[PDB]
């Protein structure tokens with residue numbers, strides 16, 4: 001029942017209840033002639049909502065807010081972007097305009113700035129060192145070290161045991177490395193091991209793109225990253 005590019009018109013967003021008061025949001029975007037799905041998270045925070053990641057661009061993100069308004073009807077009060085790339089911060093201006101408080105680590109903010117991307121307003125402290133964790137309302141934010149990017153964060157919902165890996169974690173269908181331009185291939189498996197050692201109880205693992213699964217997505221990503229490292 002998980003939404004594929006099948007039931008998603010490019011420009012539209014679907015929501016998917018993973019567990020009580022946790023959803024993924026799914027959007028699609030064209031790039032280089034192909035169409036890719038993309039996941040974010042929504043976590044209920046008392047009577048408001050915390051959003052993890054934009055829906056990859058201004059139009060998608062305005063559709064995400066409209067689809068939250070239609071289907072959950074609680075205000076989105078804060079948003080966290082898990083790394084600096086456009087698929088996670090693209091739409092930040094739309095969120096801001098709607099009066100959402102936008103957050104990212106200083107590391108993510110610096111990199112977005114250098115990249116010329118949208119820059120979340122508020123800074124998340126105490127995530128600068130590999131293995132650092134901080135509470136952020138109904139989630140824990142965790143910096144595992146460099147992987148898909150040097151600043152990538154993962155999000156864990158302790159109440160539902162949902163680990164949102166962002167783009168640091170690949171779905172099982174992805175059998176080769178994606179865009180790795182900004183990646184730390186050397187540190188990526190070590191970073192995944194930090195995620196493994198910190199959240200062994202995770203029941204649900206949501207990749208940045210594609211189908212949810214269990215903690216074996218971590219091992220899978222390690223396998224794929226290692227094969228790419230060994231290319232010749």
Ligand SMILES: [Zn+2]
Nearest residue numbers: 083085149167
């Ligand atoms: Zn990225």
Ligand SMILES: [Zn+2]
Nearest residue numbers: 101102121122
């Ligand atoms: Zn503010």
Ligand SMILES: [Zn+2]
Nearest residue numbers: 087167208209
């Ligand atoms: Zn991504």
